[PDB]
Design a protein around this ligand. Structure first.
Ligand SMILES: CCCCCCCC(=O)OC[C@H](COP(=O)(O)O[C@@H]1[C@H](O)[C@H](OP(=O)(O)O)[C@@H](O)[C@H](OP(=O)(O)O)[C@H]1O)OC(=O)CCCCCCC
Ligand SMILES: CCCCCCCC(=O)OC[C@H](COP(=O)(O)O[C@@H]1[C@H](O)[C@H](OP(=O)(O)O)[C@@H](O)[C@H](OP(=O)(O)O)[C@H]1O)OC(=O)CCCCCCC
Ligand SMILES: CCCCCCCC(=O)OC[C@H](COP(=O)(O)O[C@@H]1[C@H](O)[C@H](OP(=O)(O)O)[C@@H](O)[C@H](OP(=O)(O)O)[C@H]1O)OC(=O)CCCCCCC
Ligand SMILES: COc1ccccc1N1CCN([C@@H]2CCCC[C@H]2NS(=O)(=O)c2ccccc2)CC1
Ligand SMILES: CCCCCCCCCC
Ligand SMILES: CCCCCCCCCC
Ligand SMILES: CCCCCCCCCC
Ligand SMILES: CCCCCCCCCC
Ligand SMILES: CCCCCC
Lengths: 457, 457, 457, 457
């Protein structure tokens, strides 16, 4: 049993010297790294083109349908008078009706086919208000039924919509919905058959705040299909099958290795009888390899489905493939651990990790207290403290010396208004930055240095 | 006495093993953390809505009443000719008179009710100048009585104000004051009854510099009341009472513990007879808990008052609640100190603190000298050195590697003008940054490393 | 043999004490540093003037020929309607025809002389579309022959171009090509004879995306000649010859030293018989000196050619000269290594380097995995993750605490759209920044500290 | 002699214990710190008011006299057509003639009084061109006499200037000079008598590049006098005299101490007979005090002159006073050196300094080589590499982790143009940042840590 146990923990070189078995798994892992990286690169190259197409079409739509729109004004684009709102709505509808004659792109009208479009209708102009909405600020009185009533005009592609009358005092919002069909000719370069896009365009005039300011936004959804009857005067699926086969073989070999480890662990436990030490028979690198294989196979199946237009879950597929690629690239450290000089550094990090995590536990409570305090106190006055996630991002960036002066200057811009709040912000920011830069990061450095010193002895 | 003293310093686990008393205080502290955090989250969620309402209304007012106003131009918005100033004033008054027909919001006029509005007047247009203002720059002569005279026209909501004549050579400023009543319908979502807002709007055309440039600003004050006769087709006060009860119980238990410590200290002193060592009987964690309880109770009472519309001190309440939440979250380190691995890091920080503070004392004098020098020399030329607090913020950000290049480039933009000042700025910035980054932060790191090394032995 | 070997490794001071030979090479190296630096400074001063001339002319061309152009709008300048595109094209052509009467600069027309300009033609207005381009998005149908057909109108400098008809549905792009001749009178200051510039101006209206948005750009190529028949009412070539002679002498002496080292190494090997230890006879400083001499001589020849207008490879010459200057300035460390106090620090760096490089090897795989994952997942949503090189630059800047908050906020701006992607971005950014700042840089610091500690003992 | 020598090196406490002499110098230094700081604060408060006045007047002038000017466009403000230039010039002159009726400020015209204004002339409109300027880019020919001829029209304050004819092909520049008199009424607040300003306004249309782009700028010079015949319906000079007296007394006492040290050193040398060890008798703190006293006295005299309007050298006075304040605040470290715990840290820094400076010497050559290489190679393409001082500022900010990503992205914006330059920039930036952050700063930290470790033993 001793010999088998010793050989089980032997390094690949020692195993080859002893039994001479060819290291199939190492070569398979190298090939897997290569093919997985190539597949990810190809997928990203293909997807960025579609992303660019959709983004450019959306920018063109914003310039076409939004009155007085200019680049970089998405956040602040709003209406402030009834005349402005009416003009914007009518401009959007008129530009929809004039699209064939003015647009640089080639778009087709989509009629009916569901809701909110009635049969034969291309554009739906809906206004949503309250069922009952009596409001009298002069007498501090109101009577509202929060139930929302929707009223839509239907415009067929080529003017009753010009008779629109908005109930401003009880208006919840206004929306314009339509769809445009186009063909992605940009696919010709990069050697792909053009596909058919349907853009669902929604223009929203939002009055949910009732603050006298109605923001205006335009959004698009892209539905991609294979064009019927294509006409233009295989190395994508074979590569996917190759990747799947490589991952399956790697999974089988790693599962065999893990089973062998489990059986040897059981034998050793039985021998000793006649948990931390049990899991010594577990090869975490092979767990990582199995996880990467599963993720890659799932992502490859999803990618095959997507590229045939049968699926539209690009986010999940991209996440799976990227995570698997990261895992396979991280797995290369196993090979470096077999050399003493590199193993020194890897073991330094490994022995540092536990105390680092314990110190993270110690620091998290202070960090969270600061987050809550900053959100509650500075949230009203600071744009960077409006949400707890935003507060955490701001504090994390401050800890690393980024955007410090702008954070100070935002509060400086309102020193005269509230002196108490300004003094509190001064104390809060100074104390947090000093504590976390001059004491916490220093202790991280000290922990790493101590781990390195221990490893070198 | 020895046994009682030993038990007094026993850890909670040892105390439970010895006497078996249930650790009520620990459970109470956990519950306190939970309820305090939930209360803070709810309060912040509620307050951000009102902040958004006020900010949006103010932006709408700026777009409505300021002629030629655009987003992001608040700091530089100014008039430069008499025609521009007259046009801006008349535009503001005309937009006030046309508000019902043009505004997307629903506003009500407020008449009279104090000063500067006479009875029946909604808008007050005041101009403030000097009593006697003879100025003759041609002869380098002037005769001024600094006493300020105010002259206001009163406009009743629906044109004598069109006859306004400004005394430009002796004008101190022009102001427009009015009030608008609105109802916050946005409260319907989040399940709250709408409240009644009164916005006091002040538009200022400022000529205190007499520099030929008159900045224009708009400011609002919000007074919030409960709307009389509400009509819309309890889990906020019960939670506050629960929080107050929890904090009061924690305060009572901590006071009992502190009294026991005081009595035991007195007994030990008497025994020894028959300050640093005396305060060893003081449990600073319980002082922190008592402080947090007091702050939380005060903030909860203020919050109860505010949410009934009887109080308007949001800043003080928010500061109290945020500070108490920070304190209760920092108090969790006490529980970690009972475990050796975490106590190692906590004790490292504790033993590092004194030398860190002494080095801060050493560094403060150099920092202050640099602050004064930079303010006096670069203040005239650098926007970031205009005020001592701004100088301190800039230097602190520089020490942490933020906004360095913009600071250098601002001076670069005027190298040709004054070569001496540019050379001085070069020497000043380079020396300060080098000294504080390569020697001071390094010494902080060394102090922390030495403390950690001592603790590990 | 022992005495000769000992003298070969003697320091310059010891060699002078022993044999008394004048250290010609040291003085030559000092003179080389001086002359090389002066030459580089003069070359850069001369080149920046031409760079400024070309840049200013290009800005003037953009303001002259692009309709509605404003500074800082190069990236977003685009057309969105057929009317806008026609107006821009006609404005460019009309401004070309009116240049003599409106331009502040003095330009001459260039006619014919190649392609795309026919004989006697100054401006070429080409439109490129597809040979066959049937597109019917209504029926999801298309019939395209990807072959590109070009049709150009020729405009002679002083209106058939006004009859231009664009094939929008199959348009690939539109281009306007012309050339302008000018004289660089700015050369008079700095005491140079004015030279003759020919600017080849290309205006591109790009429709390769077929997205309804056609970006517009202007680019120029400068061809510089010596003006024929100059008339204006030697210390540049003599200095170049001096530099070349100094570099050649340094090369000869260093080659002699390297040959002596090789011969002594051969003698020692023969004696011992009767690789790491062999290369001990190689003086890497002299290899650096020889490389710098070769680079400087090549760059000086290229510079001589350029300044006579016989060459136009400014990038290669600048790279050669800058690299050689960097090498000669780095070579000064050799002289500092002869003093114990400075040699301590230099040897610290030298002994730290190998473990630093090994740790870089360990870290590269994790860095690459993160790069690929971020590119594939965040590329569609983040402007800073569009390309792998851009991803690497962003991650490298993040590791050093730059642009952290903007990176977080770009993803924050789309939290509601995709919650899964936002959560993944949170985990990705937080884990990467924490791992690389609190563990990797700490280990670099620890490696350097250990090297320094070993050197001091 | 031994007793006197021992007493000479005694600490202030030991000296007081031994001889009982009252420590007059310590109290004097404390009073000096207080009074010098108060004086600096008052001077800065007074000066930034005048700075604000001048800046506001200049902004008003830019808005009045520059056609189409908007805030934040100073750098890019330029003309591109002859029509634009004529319109700008005529607008400036017309606005000068209409100033009394349109300006919000009160200004007086200044006539004649030197050059370029003839007797009775308020505005001078000069155009500078070449004596002979034949330019024929068509034939690549030119004949220039670089002598500059100036031709000015004179406009008396209330239209021959409308007949201006510009020689565009040989124009060097156009300038408009005039002067305006105003009274600074803003001085009334802060309790000062208003003073009389004369603004010399120069508007420049610059054509020295001959690039078809003529930048337009406005500059002002302020000359300040005491207004004659002031009329408005001493604690500044007494404080200055107090400061001067305090500094003089401190100087006398420190000189006495230094003379005593010199005499004792001479006695010791004579005794031993019967440089590094000699200068042990020099008290560098007293040298610092003497320098600060001299600087403060000089700055106070200059400030007295300035505040009486007899001097205008604000930069020199501010530099002197700021440097003296920095020195006196740095001098406080002497008192901290008398306490062991603070002396530990101060001595750590003192013993670290020499090796830090030697390592700076080692690093300077690499830094300079990188500076030259970056300037020569990236200068043509990168806005941040245009000048060697700018290159140094950019590299220094990069070393400290500031503005990294923008530096990378500026080069990314031109990857396609020159691939060789882009690759070189990648290698250059990556190598520089890595070398200086992961090896140089680490060695600074290691040096400080070693110094601290040695001091603690
Ligand atoms: C076209 C490519 C075909 C490749 C596969 C066939 C050709 C080929 O070389 O296979 C090598 C593999 C082993 O490949 P591989 O896993 O690399 O080889 C094993 C590992 O080196 C293992 O050590 P660790 O790597 O540290 O765990 C070691 O203990 C085993 O020795 P032992 O056998 O004496 O105990 C080796 O056999 O051996 C098979 O017998 C395949 C059975 C697969 C069953 C999967 C489902 C359970
Ligand atoms: C106008 C300026 C003229 C300058 C040159 C003439 C005037 C002049 O001082 O020359 C000094 C040089 C040597 O100049 P240099 O190289 O500085 O001198 C040698 C180096 O010091 C070398 O040590 P390292 O520097 O550490 O390698 C040392 O071993 C040699 O001793 P050794 O001779 O006893 O072995 C020295 O002769 O000696 C010549 O004989 C020139 C032959 C050149 C052949 C080149 C083609 C192979
Ligand atoms: C209104 C305020 C008036 C203040 C001054 C008068 C009232 C007053 O206390 O003077 C204290 C000073 C000394 O003031 P101060 O300099 O503080 O006192 C001396 C220092 O403590 C010195 O040590 P260091 O400080 O380490 O150098 C020490 O060796 C001397 O002892 P010794 O005398 O036994 O050698 C002290 O006399 O003694 C005078 O006799 C003034 C002579 C000035 C001559 C200047 C021109 C050369
Ligand atoms: C001259 O250079 C160095 C002198 C001393 C120490 C390190 C380096 N550098 C070598 C090059 N290196 C790569 C730059 C391009 C991206 C990939 C980088 N490699 S990396 O290992 O992923 C890595 C990443 C971040 C931090 C450290 C290491 C940077 C470090
Ligand atoms: C050999 C088993 C333990 C090695 C560590 C597990 C993999 C680490 C993942 C980063
Ligand atoms: C146990 C008494 C001393 C513990 C320290 C006091 C509380 C620390 C507050 C951060
Ligand atoms: C003396 C031979 C080895 C010295 C090192 C080689 C030159 C270093 C280049 C930076
Ligand atoms: C006591 C003499 C030496 C003390 C150092 C000199 C003053 C340091 C200036 C920063
Ligand atoms: C020893 C008691 C630990 C308590 C953890 C909250």
């Amino acid at each position: 049993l001793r010999r088998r146990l010793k050989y089980f923990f032997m390094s690949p070189c020692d195993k080859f010297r002893a039994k001479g078995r060819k290291p199939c798994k190492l070569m398979l892992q190298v090939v897997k790294i290569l093919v997985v990286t190539v597949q990810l690169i190809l997928f990203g190259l293909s997807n960025q083109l579609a992303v660019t197409f959709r983004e450019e079409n959306t920018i063109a739509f914003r310039h076409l349908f939004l009155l007085g729109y200019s680049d970089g004004a998405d956040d602040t684009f709003a209406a402030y008078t009834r005349e402005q709102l009416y003009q914007a709505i009518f401009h959007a509808v008129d530009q929809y009706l004039a699209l064939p004659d003015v647009s640089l792109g080639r778009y087709a009208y989509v009629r009916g086919g569901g809701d909110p479009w009635t049969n034969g209708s291309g554009l739906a102009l809906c206004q949503r208000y309250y069922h009952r909405g009596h409001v009298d600020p002069a007498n501090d009185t109101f009577d509202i039924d929060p139930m929302v009533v929707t009223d839509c005009i239907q415009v067929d592609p080529p003017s009753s919509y010009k008779n629109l009358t908005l109930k401003f005092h009880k208006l919840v919002n206004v929306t314009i919905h339509f769809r445009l069909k186009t063909i992605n000719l940009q696919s010709l370069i990069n050697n792909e058959i053009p596909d058919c896009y349907t853009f669902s365009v929604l223009i929203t005039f939002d009055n949910k705040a009732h603050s006298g300011r109605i923001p205006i936004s335009l959004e698009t959804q892209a539905h991609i299909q294979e064009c019927k009857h294509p006409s233009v005067f295989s190395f994508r699926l074979l590569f996917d099958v190759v990747v799947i086969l490589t991952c399956s073989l790697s999974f089988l070999l790693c599962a065999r290795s893990l089973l062998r480890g489990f059986l040897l662990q059981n034998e050793f436990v039985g021998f000793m009888w006649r948990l931390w030490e049990r899991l010594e028979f577990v090869n975490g690198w092979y767990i990582l390899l199995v996880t990467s294989d599963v993720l890659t196979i799932s992502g490859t199946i999803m990618k095959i489905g997507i590229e045939a237009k049968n699926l539209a879950s690009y986010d999940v597929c991209s996440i799976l493939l990227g995570t698997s690629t990261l895992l396979v690239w991280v797995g290369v450290i196993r090979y470096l651990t077999f050399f003493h000089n590199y193993n020194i550094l890897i073991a330094t990090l490994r022995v540092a990790l536990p105390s680092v995590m314990r110190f993270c536990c110690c620091v998290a409570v202070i960090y969270l207290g600061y987050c809550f305090c900053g959100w509650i106190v500075l949230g009203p006055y600071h744009v960077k403290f409006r949400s707890l996630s935003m507060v955490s991002e701001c504090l994390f960036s401050l800890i690393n010396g980024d955007d410090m002066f702008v954070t100070f200057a935002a509060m400086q811009a309102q020193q005269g208004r509230s002196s108490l709040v300004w003094l509190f912000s001064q104390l809060y920011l100074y104390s947090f930055i000093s504590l976390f830069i001059y004491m916490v990061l220093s202790l991280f450095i000290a922990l790493i240095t101590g781990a390195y010193d221990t490893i070198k002895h």
